[PDB]
Amino acid sequence: LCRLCPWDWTFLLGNCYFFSKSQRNWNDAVTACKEVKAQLVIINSDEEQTFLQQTSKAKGPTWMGLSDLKKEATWLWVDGSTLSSRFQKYWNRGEPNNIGEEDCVEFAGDGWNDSKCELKKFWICKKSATPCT
Amino acid sequence: LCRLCPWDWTFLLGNCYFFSKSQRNWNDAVTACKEVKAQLVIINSDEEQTFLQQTSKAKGPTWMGLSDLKKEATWLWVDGSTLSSRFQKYWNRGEPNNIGEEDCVEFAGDGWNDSKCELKKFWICKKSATPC
Ligand SMILES: O=S(=O)(O)O[C@H]1[C@H](O)[C@@H](O)[C@@H](O)O[C@@H]1CO[C@H]1O[C@H](CO)[C@@H](O)[C@H](O)[C@H]1O
Numbered sequence: 060l061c062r063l064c065p066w067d068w069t070f071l072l073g074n075c076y077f078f079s080k081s082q083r084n085w086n087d088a089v090t091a092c093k094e095v096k097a098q099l100v101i102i103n104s105d106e107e108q109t110f111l112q113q114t115s116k117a118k119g120p121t122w123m124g125l126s127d128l129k130k131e132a133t134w135l136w137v138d139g140s141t142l143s144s145r146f147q148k149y150w151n152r153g154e155p156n157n158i159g160e161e162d163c164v165e166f167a168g169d170g171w172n173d174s175k176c177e178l179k180k181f182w183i184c185k186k187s188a189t190p191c192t
Numbered sequence: 193l194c195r196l197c198p199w200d201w202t203f204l205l206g207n208c209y210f211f212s213k214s215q216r217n218w219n220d221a222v223t224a225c226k227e228v229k230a231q232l233v234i235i236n237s238d239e240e241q242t243f244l245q246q247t248s249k250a251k252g253p254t255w256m257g258l259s260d261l262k263k264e265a266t267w268l269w270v271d272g273s274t275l276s277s278r279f280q281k282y283w284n285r286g287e288p289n290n291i292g293e294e295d296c297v298e299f300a301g302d303g304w305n306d307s308k309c310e311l312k313k314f315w316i317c318k319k320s321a322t323p324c
């Protein structure tokens with residue numbers, strides 16, 4: 060009897076992803092993921108991005124674990140690592156804008172946006188998968 | 193509030209996918225998916241193939257809804273339609289072989305094999321998603 064992931068999480072390339080059904084601000088999103096020992100989703104491959112972008116686009120605007128709250132225009136994942144320049148292409152045209160008013164990143168349609176952290180949105184969690192011999 | 197798929201099913205391009213935790217033979221997998229008004233997975237896009245293929249690689253070999261049980265070298269999806277020619281590339285090299293000993297298609301490695309239908313494998317089900 061093999062489960063790679065918790066119930067109602069989706070397996071993808073060695074990790075498990077949870078899609079919220081409700082909506083929260085960016086900080087509470089972090090918390091909610093922390094409560095299940097997970098991280099507001101960090102993106103580390105193109106395939107992951109594509110996979111999340113498409114779900115996310117069918118649900119509505121959705122938070123990822125990317126912010127410039129420490130230092131403006133320096134976008135940091137919730138684990139402290141910097142936005143690799145090879146994901147720069149996933150920002151929508153027109154984005155990011157309102158630097159120092161819009162500090163949290165969301166999926167929106169086909170790409171990424173920056174948004175007011177206080178706004179309520181869907182969120183996604185990531186944590187590692189477990190094997191099956 | 194918005195939920196595209198039943199609890200424990202995965203949304204992808206407007207369908208929902210269930211991944212079995214147990215193993216069943218091909219005919220029993222077809223049935224297992226009908227229990228919930230679904231079908232043993234049919235592949236109708238490249239992104240789908242890619243998504244299912246990686247999950248299968250973590251679980252074990254896994255049945256899809258393709259066989260040639262009806263007519264001995266024609267590959268038909270469980271819903272009656274024929275294997276489109278833009279999906280012939282997904283066959284592993286050396287596959288399909290043993291035509292007529294092996295009538296059912298499974299996910300194995302980075303492609304599709306034909307296998308003996310009697311064998312117990314994992315399965316996946318598919319039904320349409322529900323919009324928001
Ligand atoms: O040698 S096997 O891989 O076990 O058998 C395959 C083989 O790869 C292919 O050349 C042809 O002979 O089809 C057989 C069918 O065997 C099926 O069952 C085995 C036993 O567990 C599975 O591992 C295979 O994935 C499957 O094809």
Ligand SMILES: [Ca+2]
Binds near residue numbers: 172173
């Ligand atoms: Ca913005």
Ligand SMILES: [Ca+2]
Binds near residue numbers: 305
């Ligand atoms: Ca074979």
